[PDB]
Amino acid sequence: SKVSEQLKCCSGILKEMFAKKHAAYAWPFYKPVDVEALGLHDYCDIIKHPMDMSTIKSKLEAREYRDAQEFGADVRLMFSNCYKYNPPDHEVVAMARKLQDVFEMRFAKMPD
Amino acid sequence: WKTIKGKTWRTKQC
Ligand SMILES: [N]
């Protein structure tokens, strides 16, 4: 049941990531990456496993995550795809650091 | 103007 209470905290962490408090830098991660946008024609060639916040929420509701570490692996996969595809100086990379900082600070205080 | 991940728009300031 320790795992069950951890997965409940994962939902609250993702809820804060969806909150308006962070919407100024968390919006590029709400929905899956729109590969039909200009300049993103080579995203599926660089990123082999896409991941977004809506997919993480869908798998939380479907209870696909066994433990909280599998949840964090997808959250960090979401940020790693941004670090790998986008050049470092881009603004979206800076937005990923701000949202990941919010995640890592909340994820570190997981009940144990 | 601003462009992020193919999304281009004009801010309210400009
Ligand atoms: N503007």
Q: Does B10 touch chain A (CB under 8 A)?
A: no
Angstrom resolution of this structure: 2.6
The DSSP bridge partners found for residue B9 are B2
Query: A34 touching B, CB under 8 A?
Result: yes
Distance (Å, whole) CA A33 – CA A51? 8
How is residue A15 written in tokens? 């809820």
Whole-angstrom Cα distance, residue A110 to residue A108? 5
Ligand 1, atom 1: closest residue by C-alpha: B14
Classify strands B7-9 and B2-4 as parallel, antiparallel or unpaired: antiparallel
Please give the angle made by the CA atoms of B5, B8 and B13, to the nearest 5 degrees.
Answer: 125
The answer to whether the CB atoms of B7 and A37 lie below 8 A apart is yes
Q: How was this structure determined?
A: X-ray
B1 Cβ inside 6 Å of ligand 1: no
Give me the phi and psi of A64, to 5 degrees please. -80, -25
Tokens linked to B1:
């103007």
C-alpha A104/C-alpha A39 separation (Å) is 30
CA dist A101 → A25, A97, A108 (Å): 12, 6, 11
Residues of B in contact with A91 (CB under 8 A): 4
CA dihedral sign, ordered A60, A65, A68, A71: negative
Q: Give Cβ neighbours of residue A88 (< 8 Å, ≥ 6 apart).
A: none
- The minimum CA-CA distance between B2 and chain A, rounded to whole Å, is 10
Cα B3 to ligand 1 centre (Å): 15
A17-22's contacts with Cβ under 8 Å and 24+ in sequence apart are: A17/A53, A17/A99, A17/A102, A17/A103, A18/A53, A18/A57, A22/A98, A22/A99, A22/A102
Nearest-CA residue of chain A relative to B8?
Answer: A38
Buried b (16+ CB within 10 A) or exposed e, A44-58: eeebeeebbbeebbe
Ligand 1: centre distance to CA A108 (Å): 41
Given a contact cutoff of 8 angstroms between Cβ atoms, the answer to whether A6 and A29 are in contact is no
